Amino acid sequence: GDGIALTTTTNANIYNWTGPNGFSSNSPNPTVISPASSANAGTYTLVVQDFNGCTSPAASTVVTVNAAPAQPSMTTNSPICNGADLVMSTSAAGNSYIWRAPNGADTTTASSTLTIVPTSSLYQSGNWTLSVVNAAGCVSPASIASAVEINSIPSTASAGNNGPVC
Amino acid sequence: GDGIALTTTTNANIYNWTGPNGFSSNSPNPTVISPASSANAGTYTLVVQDFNGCTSPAASTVVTVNAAPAQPSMTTNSPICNGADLVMSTSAAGNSYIWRAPNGADTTTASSTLTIVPTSSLYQSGNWTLSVVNAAGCVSPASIASAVEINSIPSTASAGNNGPVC
């Protein structure tokens, strides 16, 4: 999902780049490959032709592409009464977990389980999502949102009885 | 999000521009790069060929791209009764905060918290959004709207009792 950029240091007249998917360029500092995927992993080779018409031996480098984790899933204690702790968790593996609140608030934890204490700006109802990040620093697609419904505490009912009893 | 423009001052026959993403042009005053992103930051080099066929030494300049802040989030006292002050706030950092009313009214403040006194043209219900601007003058994506619900004050109930009591 990130891009692959190549650069040059020479000031020669003709550049010739070649790569894994038919990548080709006749310019220094070529158009960055935006959608990096494993398809573009491999060796990129540069040949440079001088002002005098002579060519260099080729130079080359290797770029690898780290894969993102699979879309994680989320479980929540969604039928929740106001004042109770909000608990959400995944089963997905990762090095760090990313929790996204409905209103955009965004926090992290090393744990697969997040607990939100109702003093927090995160104690909010609506659709919550999760994404995870692995050791390569790759972020998974976000999970399918799980709704959280925080219910109010009802008022009390008047209560009594029929009055004095023999 | 803004564009990168390059210009010339010469009247020579052939222009040769080159840049960071394979940017290339054979004309003076090239097509402005509209979607500036960090991808196009770097050195842009111009070489000019004369009417007589001779070429200039190259001239060059550097353009950098300032990044916008990440999408901020908003918190509001949304269950609000008419006449009460409307309070909205963010946690996002910035040099100035931009507050957008549902009906398009647009105000600013240096504070992360905005208070609207109900005499104001901004004391309106509906979906509010926020964006922030940093020291480079870059404006963040707008936040996910937060609804504000301004409720009316109900009329009174008739009240009384059963009448005189022994």
SS3 A39: helix
Sort out which chain A residues have CB atoms less than 8 A from B42's CB and list them: 29
B29: left (phi over 0), alpha (psi -120 to 50) or beta: left
Å between B72 CA and nearest CA of chain A: 7
Measured in whole angstroms, the distance separating CA B23 from the mean position of its chain's CA atoms is 27
Å between B58 CA and nearest CA of chain A: 10
Long-range contacts of A81-86 (CB under 8 A, 24+ apart): A81/A150, A81/A151, A81/A153, A82/A118, A82/A150, A82/A151, A82/A152, A82/A153, A83/A118, A83/A153, A84/A118, A85/A115, A85/A116, A85/A117, A85/A118, A86/A115, A86/A116, A86/A118, A86/A122, A86/A123, A86/A148, A86/A150
Contact at CB, A103 and B72, closer than 8 angstroms: no
Long-range contacts of A30-36 (CB under 8 A, 24+ apart): A30/A6, A30/B21, A30/B22, A31/B21, A31/B22, A32/A3, A32/A4, A32/A5, A32/B21, A32/B39, A33/A3, A33/A4, A33/A5, A34/A3, A35/A1, A35/A3, A36/A1, A36/A2, A36/A3, A36/A4, A36/A65
Best residue in B18, B21, B43, B65 to probe A by mutation, most A CBs within 10 Å? B21
Query: Cβ of B96: how many Cβ atoms within 10 Å?
Result: 14
Sort out which chain B residues have CB atoms less than 8 A from A98's CB and list them: none
Tokens of residue A113, six digits: 């389980």
Contact at CB, A102 and B22, closer than 8 angstroms: no
